[PDB]
Design a binder for this molecule. Sequence first.
Ligand SMILES: CCCCCCCCO[C@@H]1O[C@H](CO)[C@@H](O)[C@H](O)[C@H]1O
Ligand SMILES: CCCCCCCCO[C@@H]1O[C@H](CO)[C@@H](O)[C@H](O)[C@H]1O
Ligand SMILES: CCCCCCCCO[C@@H]1O[C@H](CO)[C@@H](O)[C@H](O)[C@H]1O
Ligand SMILES: CCCCCCCCO[C@@H]1O[C@H](CO)[C@@H](O)[C@H](O)[C@H]1O
Ligand SMILES: CCCCCCCCO[C@@H]1O[C@H](CO)[C@@H](O)[C@H](O)[C@H]1O
Ligand SMILES: CCCCCCCCO[C@@H]1O[C@H](CO)[C@@H](O)[C@H](O)[C@H]1O
Ligand SMILES: CCCCCCCCO[C@@H]1O[C@H](CO)[C@@H](O)[C@H](O)[C@H]1O
Ligand SMILES: CCCCCCCCO[C@@H]1O[C@H](CO)[C@@H](O)[C@H](O)[C@H]1O
Ligand SMILES: CCCCCCCCO[C@@H]1O[C@H](CO)[C@@H](O)[C@H](O)[C@H]1O
Ligand SMILES: CCCCCCCCO[C@@H]1O[C@H](CO)[C@@H](O)[C@H](O)[C@H]1O
Ligand SMILES: *SCC1=CC(C)(C)N(O)C1(C)C
Ligand SMILES: *SCC1=CC(C)(C)N(O)C1(C)C
Ligand SMILES: CC(C)C[C@H](N)C(=O)O
Ligand SMILES: CC(C)C[C@H](N)C(=O)O
Ligand SMILES: [Cl-]
Ligand SMILES: [Cl-]
Ligand code: NA
Ligand code: NA
Ligand code: NA
Ligand code: NA
Lengths: 505, 505
Amino acid sequence: REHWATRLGLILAMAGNAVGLGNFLRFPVQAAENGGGAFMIPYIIAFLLVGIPLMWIEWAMGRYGGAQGHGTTPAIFYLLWRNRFAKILGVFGLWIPLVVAIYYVYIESWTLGFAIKFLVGLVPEPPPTDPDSILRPFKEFLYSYIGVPKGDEPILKPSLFAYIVFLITMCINVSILIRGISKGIERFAKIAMPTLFILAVFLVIRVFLLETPNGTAADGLNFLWTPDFEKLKDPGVWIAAVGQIFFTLSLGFGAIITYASYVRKDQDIVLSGLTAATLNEKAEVILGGSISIPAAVAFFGVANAVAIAKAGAFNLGFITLPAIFSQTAGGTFLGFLWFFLLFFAGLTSSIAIMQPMIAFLEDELKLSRKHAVLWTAAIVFFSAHLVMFLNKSLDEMDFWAGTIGVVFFGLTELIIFFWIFGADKAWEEINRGGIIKVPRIYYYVMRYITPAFLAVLLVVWAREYIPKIMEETHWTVWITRFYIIGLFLFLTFLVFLAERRRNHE
Amino acid sequence: REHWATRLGLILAMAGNAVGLGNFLRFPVQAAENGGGAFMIPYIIAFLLVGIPLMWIEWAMGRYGGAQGHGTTPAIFYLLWRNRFAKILGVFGLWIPLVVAIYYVYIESWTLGFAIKFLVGLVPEPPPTDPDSILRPFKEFLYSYIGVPKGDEPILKPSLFAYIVFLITMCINVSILIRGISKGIERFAKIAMPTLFILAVFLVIRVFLLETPNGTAADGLNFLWTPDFEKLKDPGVWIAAVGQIFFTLSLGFGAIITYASYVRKDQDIVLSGLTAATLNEKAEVILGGSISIPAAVAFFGVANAVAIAKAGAFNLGFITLPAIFSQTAGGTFLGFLWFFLLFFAGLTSSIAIMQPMIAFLEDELKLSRKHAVLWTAAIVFFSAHLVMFLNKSLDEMDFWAGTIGVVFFGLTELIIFFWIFGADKAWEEINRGGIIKVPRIYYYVMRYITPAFLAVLLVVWAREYIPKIMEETHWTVWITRFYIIGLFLFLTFLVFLAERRRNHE
Ligand SMILES: CCCCCCCCO[C@@H]1O[C@H](CO)[C@@H](O)[C@H](O)[C@H]1O
Ligand SMILES: CCCCCCCCO[C@@H]1O[C@H](CO)[C@@H](O)[C@H](O)[C@H]1O
Ligand SMILES: CCCCCCCCO[C@@H]1O[C@H](CO)[C@@H](O)[C@H](O)[C@H]1O
Ligand SMILES: CCCCCCCCO[C@@H]1O[C@H](CO)[C@@H](O)[C@H](O)[C@H]1O
Ligand SMILES: CCCCCCCCO[C@@H]1O[C@H](CO)[C@@H](O)[C@H](O)[C@H]1O
Ligand SMILES: CCCCCCCCO[C@@H]1O[C@H](CO)[C@@H](O)[C@H](O)[C@H]1O
Ligand SMILES: CCCCCCCCO[C@@H]1O[C@H](CO)[C@@H](O)[C@H](O)[C@H]1O
Ligand SMILES: CCCCCCCCO[C@@H]1O[C@H](CO)[C@@H](O)[C@H](O)[C@H]1O
Ligand SMILES: CCCCCCCCO[C@@H]1O[C@H](CO)[C@@H](O)[C@H](O)[C@H]1O
Ligand SMILES: CCCCCCCCO[C@@H]1O[C@H](CO)[C@@H](O)[C@H](O)[C@H]1O
Ligand SMILES: *SCC1=CC(C)(C)N(O)C1(C)C
Ligand SMILES: *SCC1=CC(C)(C)N(O)C1(C)C
Ligand SMILES: CC(C)C[C@H](N)C(=O)O
Ligand SMILES: CC(C)C[C@H](N)C(=O)O
Ligand SMILES: [Cl-]
Ligand SMILES: [Cl-]
Ligand code: NA
Ligand code: NA
Ligand code: NA
Ligand code: NA
């Protein structure tokens, strides 16, 4: 088995797994939409009651699996629970990350294309203070790039440059992944994360200096960090907060498991997992939280910045932020630094959500790394055509895989490891080699509190909101559902082939 | 390896492979649309210059492959031409029949559902002689069954009964296939083909008695069998005639190859292939040609019967014919016999276009018959959802796989076997064990004439008509193209896995 060379490379690979577009694009939008500081209490709580414990459970599952030659959940679930159903439930830890990779890599490619365009100055000039005369050239710029539909038909027409940048993006992911764990992901992480950190701190400082007639950066911080105890009653905030925790810590995606399967059997995971987790939250609440929303609030005031966050997932980061930067000296280059930040943030994360399919092909079907990586990249690339051309396919995949699915899978992996395999064996396995011990109270959190909290949330989700997505959506959502159900069946088929290949020896 | 038990079972399995919906639904429509007897000269010629020779080439390829443990074209092409590209071109002999199976099995299920409904009398009464007041209840009956779109959206809403009959249909195919070659396909063929023959002769006799103020059955025969030498110049007729030959003889679909791979290395294929071919043409021109068109012409005259054939692929067989029967005593039951005829015709053919994927899984991935058949059925069933719900997906698959693809593949398999592997070795291999020898002139037909004829036709096809299908169609055709390109990549992936499984020993 491959192994992480260094402790530092390990922590930074895992930190890069976690620190991604979630931190810089998703977090701000979810925080702004859900009351700012009102979002934050549930967020911090979700972190303490869901984030930390699942992080520890997945590193533990992964290291355990790795010591026996298996880094993905079809195998690892079965090693934990020797029942053929364990294998099928385990297909979600290949499918989720594959499906999420199919849209994430595309969004990551938009950051590269914008980075390119901003650096070279092929961007709009807004005229030489009507907000709409400034936002509109940027809305059009995003809209042409991805080809948002101008008519009735739910079809996208991405620009040729978008398409080619997607190819290139795929190529860069491959060039890292194909070199493997220590020479690829890990060497890359040691360069990308300090660059990410520097760029983000530069950006936070630049944002902190913005001041207009409508506000300062300080107002955005007060908005975000000022508690609204009203909203502690709204189930929507909680659902928002918990989904964000999972997305941002990469929990429920098989990705932490797979990375942890390269940790040596002996090596600490308790301190290392906490540090990765903590590096992610710093990057999210300190860096990601201090760029977009304070910039938006400085220029437009709170009400308008909230309205913008509710407008679309990408308005804030791809339209408003560069629009704002465009009104400041050297603003095109700050846009470049922002997109370049997003890109490296994306790329360190996308390699992490392709590695599970790679590990499965290597571990279970005995493909060479080269073939495993190329077939993985070919599947993602191909599938991404749906997300590039069918309007709102991105959204449907992000809902099934990236939102519901991850919460489902987190509860599942928790029940398999901490209830079926056994709480006391799970605890011992988490703690073994630990440089620190998990605090004892977390035992009761893992066994009782975390599974209750997730099961309740999932019930509320399936009742109050998923009937709307099955009933209020355009018919073309069935194109996406059909395809990704197919991907699941394809993956179940490879699990089957892998089980026959075993028997045959 | 499995083998056909008996010579008779062999011939009748192969005859059942060929004799299908092509004979009873496709042929009449293509003949009527293309001038009747005007179609027939090119048809007969295509049979002599394409049909017979390719039949012999595919049995030969199949038997050859079988003796070495391989019944599908990824392996057999490579056995003939040891170049990795041979393996990829060979994926068409899995993909074509899989894609065609995805819509054919659905159409076959419509014949079962109608057979059921006609037997039990749950059919429309037209009122107690305005043609439209009689055709319309039948148009509505087909339209509700399959759920033809009533509005703007290209979405189908098949009835629940249609859907469940599709399941049952899948189940019946599986029940035959899962018993294997001799105990399944072959035992089934010995029952189904004499039933098919009896039912069709009953139907021809009943049709021959029809007479109305607008004509007799005799007029339909004269129409079909009366040469129009004008049309010998229209390339469209020729393209029509040749596509029909391929479809009806199952050439270019990997299916004859795969069945022939169960013939023992020694056993004749020259006489046996000719007989299968000849049984098919009898069933097509004598039986299939004598039911629909003479019935239509008896009731409506020639001009109107031609207009009906041009109206739709299914108007003649699912709407007009039962409508006509409805005006005669015992007419609901004749409809039943007609649908039951179609069903058995379909079922003996659909098992033949699923067996290649089965053989590939058995031969190359070493699945048991059971698993190979179940995974095959699951893939077809799943994929058929596209054809059941997306209006015109059926048509796009029938064009790429069932029309262009088969002509492409026929030329390819001809070049691989008779040019690359070697004309003299191909000839010797065709003739070995022969109970009769292939006439010598066919050597020059196979090497020179057949490949020229197909290459010319394919060039004319790609020039005069496929730019229209890439340019004049609704956007949703890309849903189907995307999916079936995906199927191709999936199959290429299994070929890859099969080549690694080999190496690993
Ligand atoms: C190689 C895989 C084949 C799948 C079919 C995808 C064809 C991509 O099509 C390309 O899309 C771009 C973006 O809209 C267009 O601008 C290009 O001109 C077009 O050629
Ligand atoms: C590393 C960056 C890759 C650059 C990809 C080139 C995309 C080209 O883009 C195309 O070509 C023209 C360029 O002159 C444009 O004017 C066209 O509108 C555009 O379709
Ligand atoms: C399900 C995903 C399918 C995507 C395949 C779309 C192929 C690209 O579409 C093709 O190229 C151009 C680019 O949009 C169009 O203008 C052309 O008319 C079309 O043929
Ligand atoms: C409210 C849920 C979050 C749990 C936070 C736990 C913080 C650590 O809590 C500490 O754990 C030590 C190690 O077991 C104990 O010995 C200490 O008494 C305790 O303060
Ligand atoms: C590829 C074939 C797709 C067509 C299937 C459409 C079936 C119609 O069902 C659709 O389901 C949508 C999503 O749940 C609902 O929002 C709509 O009410 C409904 O039109
Ligand atoms: C089992 C594979 C799941 C794929 C989703 C397909 C769901 C089929 O949906 C079924 O279609 C019928 C035909 O229109 C409807 O009449 C039924 O009421 C409906 O439940
Ligand atoms: C072997 C034949 C299988 C029969 C499948 C039953 C299909 C039922 O069909 C359904 O149920 C009702 C029957 O009372 C109909 O009236 C409904 O309209 C229909 O949706
Ligand atoms: C690409 C093929 C996708 C087919 C999946 C369609 C699932 C069936 O569609 C579902 O069931 C009913 C039957 O049409 C609809 O009325 C429901 O609103 C829809 O949810
Ligand atoms: C025009 C293309 C169709 C070919 C029809 C060939 C019919 C058989 O032709 C016969 O073949 C025998 C065997 O080689 C010869 O010995 C005979 O001379 C010849 O009549
Ligand atoms: C699943 C994503 C599908 C959307 C892709 C649509 C790309 C637009 O290209 C379409 O191609 C059709 C077929 O070649 C042409 O007939 C049309 O002119 C055109 O709208
Ligand atoms: S460089 C990445 C790449 C190129 C191509 C051959 C088009 N691919 O399938 C991948 C995604 C492997
Ligand atoms: S009986 C045929 C059948 C049933 C089901 C389990 C739904 N399938 O996948 C197949 C098509 C095998
Ligand atoms: C799917 C995950 C890799 C996403 C990553 N945790 C991010 O926040 O963007
Ligand atoms: C695809 C083939 C099996 C079709 C069969 N030759 C028929 O005429 O219907
Ligand atoms: Cl662009
Ligand atoms: Cl019905
Ligand atoms: Na994150
Ligand atoms: Na990242
Ligand atoms: Na036929
Ligand atoms: Na048949």
